[PDB]
């Protein structure tokens, strides 16, 4: 914010798979402080994706992530009383965060079955460049291309 540089919280590794990448995903899907529910959904959905993809557990998560994590984004950057969005690059840390938020939001849409399946479908579509999350990354990528004049 205004004054300082704030610290980090360093997160805790995911129980079943020793990667903090999936731990942050569980935290994003978390609602109302119910972490046991959040991990239960993620574990089940990632397991029923292992039957749909072939990659074991984590490769099939990253190849979904790498498809929906963007590279540039437009933010309101007025100068002279302006109303146009300057396309700017996204730092690598935010790229994962924007990817996870988009996947979870899309999964909360596309109501087909319980949350286990809705998540499972979305990562499978992300793994093949098809879902609503990968569509959203294209919308922002297309909104930055339209604004590429401003730099």
């Amino acid at each position: 914010p205004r004054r300082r540089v704030i610290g980090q919280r360093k997160i805790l590794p995911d129980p079943k798979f020793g990667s903090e990448l999936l731990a942050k995903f569980v935290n994003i899907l978390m609602v109302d402080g119910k972490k046991s529910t959040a991990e239960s959904i993620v574990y089940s959905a990632l397991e029923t994706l292992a039957q749909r993809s072939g990659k074991s557990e984590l490769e099939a998560f990253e190849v979904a992530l790498e498809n929906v994590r963007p590279t540039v984004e437009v933010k309101s950057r007025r100068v002279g009383g302006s109303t146009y969005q300057v396309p700017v690059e996204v730092r690598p840390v935010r790229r994962n965060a924007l990817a996870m938020r988009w996947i979870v939001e899309a999964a909360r849409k596309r109501g087909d079955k319980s949350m286990a399946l809705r998540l499972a479908n979305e990562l499978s579509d992300a793994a093949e460049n098809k879902g609503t999350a990968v569509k959203k990354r294209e919308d922002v990528h297309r909104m930055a291309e339209a604004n590429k004049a401003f730099a």
């Binding site: 460049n129 098809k130 879902g131 569509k135 294209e138």
Partner: protein, 78 residues
């Protein structure tokens, strides 16, 4: 239908609360209204794609194949 009735139908379809499935061969008319693409291919596979025609083409470009020549234009005479 002509272009005028076509545009009127497109507007009426847009102002629809329910849902519709439209079979057509007019790519432009289908593109101006379609939100989910159900496209038939060879060997009886019906590829389903949630999105409009712009993002359908973008998905194909994202995972595409290298060629562009459909026809042969065989003949009539002899």
């Amino acid at each position: 239908l002509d272009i005028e009735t076509l545009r009127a139908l497109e507007n009426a379809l847009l102002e629809f609360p329910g849902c519709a499935m439209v079979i057509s061969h007019d790519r432009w008319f289908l593109d101006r209204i379609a939100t989910h693409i159900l496209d038939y291919q060879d060997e009886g596979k019906v590829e389903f794609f949630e999105g409009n025609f712009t993002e359908y083409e973008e998905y194909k470009k994202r995972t595409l194949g290298a060629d562009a020549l459909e026809p042969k234009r065989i003949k009539y005479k002899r």
